[PDB]
């Protein structure tokens, strides 16, 4: 698949375990973030002593989540779960497993 | 050019007017941000009443961006203290006609 970068939000829709999520492609971030409002209440989260330069000691998924795209590619991520975010943010942890590259005509 | 996305910071080096800057490709941002620490003191910046999710400074002028293949255009970045890296937003990336692709 191909997605030009424009003024519009670059987005991907995929599954984490059994649930569909939509998020912003976020090359700027090492790690994936799910906004607390999209986080399934029954899925366990845990404190971390990680710090995110961009929210200190954020929550993270207790378990690894199986990501799956619409072509049935899959892998594991363990996202951070952050309160008061407008959008999910797909980081380079996920993007790299989907073998996504950036290219210019030139 | 082609750059796989990996754990390493995806970076671009280019000119804004006469000066070289290096930064992180930041698809998540509408607008480009330059570290106040890298910002030439003689280049004017202005208050805004915009918030970036606050009241940040922005370049008073449009800056001519130029890459190493001599593609060019205009951006007007925000200028923010206390960031570790410059951040290339979609204002710049869209003018460079950058695509994301997967095998």
């Amino acid at each position: 698949w191909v997605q030009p970068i424009t003024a519009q939000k670059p987005s991907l829709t995929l599954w984490l375990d059994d649930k569909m999520f939509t998020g912003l492609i976020n090359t700027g971030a090492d790690v994936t973030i799910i906004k607390l409002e999209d986080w399934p209440p029954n899925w366990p989260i845990t404190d971390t002593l990680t710090n995110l330069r961009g929210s200190n000691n954020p929550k993270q998924s207790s378990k690894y989540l199986t990501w799956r795209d619409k072509e049935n590619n899959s892998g594991l991520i363990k996202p951070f779960v952050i309160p008061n975010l407008p959008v999910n943010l797909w980081g380079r942890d996920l993007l790299s497993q989907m073998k996504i590259m950036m290219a210019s005509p030139n | 050019w082609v750059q796989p996305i990996t754990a390493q910071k995806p970076s671009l080096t280019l000119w804004l007017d006469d000066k070289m800057f290096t930064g992180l490709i930041n698809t998540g941002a509408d607008v480009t941000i330059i570290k106040l620490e890298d910002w030439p003191p003689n280049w004017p910046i202005t208050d805004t009443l915009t918030n970036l999710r606050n009241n940040p400074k922005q370049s008073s002028k449009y800056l001519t961006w130029r890459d190493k293949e001599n593609n060019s255009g205009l951006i007007k970045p925000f200028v923010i203290p206390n960031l570790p890296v410059n951040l290339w937003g979609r204002d710049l990336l869209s003018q460079m006609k950058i695509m994301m692709a997967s095998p």
Binding site: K9, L24, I25, N26, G28, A29, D30, V31, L52, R53, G54, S55, P86, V87, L89 | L24, N26, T27, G28, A29, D30, V31, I33, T50, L52, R53, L83, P84, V85, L87, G89
Partner: peptide
Amino acid sequence: PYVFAMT
């Protein structure tokens, strides 16, 4: 404008 970086 929304600005989504972090180590």
